Amino acid sequence: QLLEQSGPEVKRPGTSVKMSCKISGGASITQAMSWVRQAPGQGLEWMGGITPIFGTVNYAQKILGRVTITADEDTVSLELSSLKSEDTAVYYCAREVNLKTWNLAHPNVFDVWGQGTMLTVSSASTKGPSVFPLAPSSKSTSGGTAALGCLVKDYFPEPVTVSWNSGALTSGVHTFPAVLQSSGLYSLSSVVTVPSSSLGTQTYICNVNHKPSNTKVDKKVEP
Amino acid sequence: NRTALNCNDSLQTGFITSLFYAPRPCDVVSARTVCGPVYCFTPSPVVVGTTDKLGIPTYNWGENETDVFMLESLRPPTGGWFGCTWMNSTGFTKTCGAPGGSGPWITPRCLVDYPYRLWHYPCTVNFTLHKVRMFVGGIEHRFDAACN
Amino acid sequence: LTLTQSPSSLSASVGDRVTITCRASQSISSFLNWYQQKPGKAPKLLIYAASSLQSGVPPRFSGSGSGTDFTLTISSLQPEDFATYYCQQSYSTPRTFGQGTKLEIKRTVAAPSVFIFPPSDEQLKSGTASVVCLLNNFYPREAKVQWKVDNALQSGNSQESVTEQDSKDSTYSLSSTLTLSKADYEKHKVYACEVTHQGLSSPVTKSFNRG
Ligand SMILES: *[C@@H]1O[C@H](CO)[C@@H](O[C@@H]2O[C@H](CO)[C@@H](O)[C@H](O)[C@H]2NC(C)=O)[C@H](O)[C@H]1NC(C)=O
Ligand SMILES: *[C@@H]1O[C@H](CO)[C@@H](O)[C@H](O)[C@H]1NC(C)=O
């Protein structure tokens, strides 16, 4: 039903990476699985697929020399060797199924997708971000609505995920795309509009995650 | 390739994982509605593979519409008790047989043992096996029977 | 086989009927599937077998075609339909996708709400000052944002970022961040953000004084 994928990776050119994908439950791997990669700002591209009953594995012609797809009882993995900058992409696992007959021997549609694992191939140094409050004040409240947020500055590489109140606050949240600063580091803001009358009683915490630097921060934003 | 593998488990029950890891008259059944082995029970258990309408074996894993199981061809020519069992698409155990029980029930208390018995009949794990040797229609049959 | 989608970009209003075509370089029978990808998320299956609607997909989505030419139809566009759409063939041995069709949504003019954020005291201790101006839920995308420091027009020290089109009201939001050193930030008092937009009869200005 649901697919879990391993976290984002930052790798120097020439090394190898192994990305994995789990069923995120008590279930074992039965259906055919495939890996689809998406370069940033680009389209979907099939790389390879594995069929557990046959054990067979297919690959794309462009990467046949340096990609291997393995599976066990509950985990499908994808390994890329001799990594290069063009391998920077998000990598999806997708369960391939036959929705007409549910025959294990002829899968022909990707019905369930993992949320993606982003890979960055770069020689630059990983750097964790600083998190600053964007506090609501008279200058951040117009009429009955108040604005507040978090500034996430100076990190590398992509991506950084931010939630609010551990995911319970989503309505009216804008997590912008990152800008590329002149220093080569990324910078990011995430804001939310809330009622101005509630600033004294409500609690707003942004949860910033940057896994490549093991940065995990919960910052309370107060007026 | 002789085994039908049409297994929809949208209810997430898990009958497919146990395959890889650890009434009605027996006439013709469509492979597209079958998941896993099809065991026909003469006095002993027999495995039936996918064929076309003439009896020629097919190797399409039961995907095509023409793939069927010839259950009547497995009926003993002498006319003894007979039945077949299998699992259908959504993970339910199906049986066929004459008005001995329906599928593998020689006795309302006993059941013919076969490799996928615990897959098709999980409620008979605690049953006791009895080695049985008998002649039915001039043919010796050696098999085990799981009873209460 | 090769899949080519037409068009690559699409613009329509809520309630419009839209179609997207996929053209296969050779016959793929009916092993054509459609996927919807909203920004930052995994693709989502809409149509399998070129014409079968997936369980849980709204009925306004429909597919048709066979052989080499295929079509995805949205009978009545909705704000949530803002996404990129891909066709995928599962006939040959290497699975392939179409280039993808980006679907933008047109709506009425909506003026931005403007908010300004001074730098936090935490950041000022570190030696840098970031002043954030926010434009919230506006349409269309074109918006002019100017920074004024002690009434002097600024240039070369700000970066803009725009959200994707919202899935409920089809609007955009923008952030313009003025980055000054700690020293330069203390040299001035009035920090202003002047916003020009089609929905604003006059340039709205939000400002604060340091302190
Ligand atoms: C697989 O076997 C099950 C066994 O019951 C079938 O489920 C029955 O479907 C009929 C359809 O009219 C219902 O009226 C019954 O109530 C169902 N039985 C149970 C116990 O739920 C199922 O239809 C079979 N699959 C196919 C494709 O025929
Ligand atoms: C299981 O698959 C069959 C054939 O694809 C389909 O008819 C049936 O509706 C599916 N089960 C459910 C609960 O929809």
Q: What is the CATH number of the domain that holds C43?
A: 2.60.40.10
Q: Which residues of B touch A101 (CB under 8 A)?
A: 6, 32, 63
- Rounded to whole angstroms, how far apart are CA atoms A109 and C48? 7
Can you give the resolution of this entry in Å? 2.4
Å from CA of A148 to ligand 1 middle: 55
Q: What radius of gyration do chain B's Cα atoms show?
A: 15
> Domain containing B116: what range?
1-148
**Ligand 2 pocket, residue B10 CB under 6 Å:** yes
Task: For residues C64 and C153, state if they share a domain.
Answer: no
Q: How many domains does chain C have?
A: 2
Q: Which ligand is nearest to the CA of C48?
A: 2
Neighbouring-strand partners of residue A37: A45, A91
C91 in the same domain as C63: yes
Please measure the distance between the N-terminal and C-terminal CA atoms of chain A and give it in whole angstroms: 42
Question: Is the same domain home to C100 and C183?
Answer: no
CA distance A198 to A222: 12
C191 & C102 share domain? no
Whether ligand 2 lies within 6 angstroms of the CB of A109 is answered as no
Domains and CATH numbers, chain A: 4-121 (2.60.40.10), 130-221 (2.60.40.10)
DSSP H or E segment with residue B117: helix B117-120
The letter for the amino acid at C41 is: K
Q: Are residues C91 and C13 part of one domain?
A: yes
Contacts of A142 in chain C (CB under 8 A): 113-115
Atom 21, ligand 1: residue with shortest CA distance: B92
Give Dmax (Cα) for chain B: 47
Method: X-ray
Domain containing C79 equals 3-106
Report the C-alpha gap between B45 and B94 in whole angstroms. Answer: 16
Say yes or no: C31 contacts chain A, CB-CB below 8 A: yes
Whether residues C127 and C182 fall in one domain: yes
* CB pairs A-B closer than 8 Å: 39
- Sign of the torsion formed by the C-alpha atoms of A138, A143, A146 and A147: negative
- From B5, B6, B8, the mutation candidate for ligand 2 (largest count of ligand atoms within 8 A of CB) is B8
Backbone gaps in chain B, preceding residues (C–N over 2.5 A): 22, 99
Domain boundary (C76, C106, C136) is at C106
- B41 sits in which H/E element: strand B38-41
C117's CB contacts (< 8 A; 6+ apart) are A134, A135, A139, A140, A147, A149, C131, C132, C133, C134
Same domain, C9 and C102: yes
Per the CB < 8 Å rule, is B6 touching A1? Answer: no
How many domains does the structure of chain B reveal?
A: 1
CA of C34 to the centre of ligand 2 (A): 20
Strands C101-106 and C9-13, bridge-based pairing: parallel
Q: How far is the CA of B51 from the centre of ligand 2 (A)?
A: 24
- C-alpha C17/C-alpha B30 separation (Å) is 42
Q: How many angstroms from the chain centroid is the CA of residue A20?
A: 13
User: Are C102 and C125 contained in the same domain?
Assistant: no
The number of residues in chain A equals: 223
Q: Please indicate, yes or no, whether residues C126 and C204 belong to a single structural domain of this protein.
A: yes
- Residue C3: helix, strand or coil by DSSP? strand
Single residue among C106, C125, C153 that ends a domain in this structure: C106
Query: Encoding tokens for residue A45?
Result: 């591209």
| Shared domain check, C162 and C126 | yes
Nearest listed ligand to the Cα of residue B30: 1
Q: Which chain C residues are within 8 Å of A2, Cβ to Cβ?
A: none
A199 CA: distance to closest CA in chain B (Å): 45
Contact B61, A103 (CB under 8 A): yes
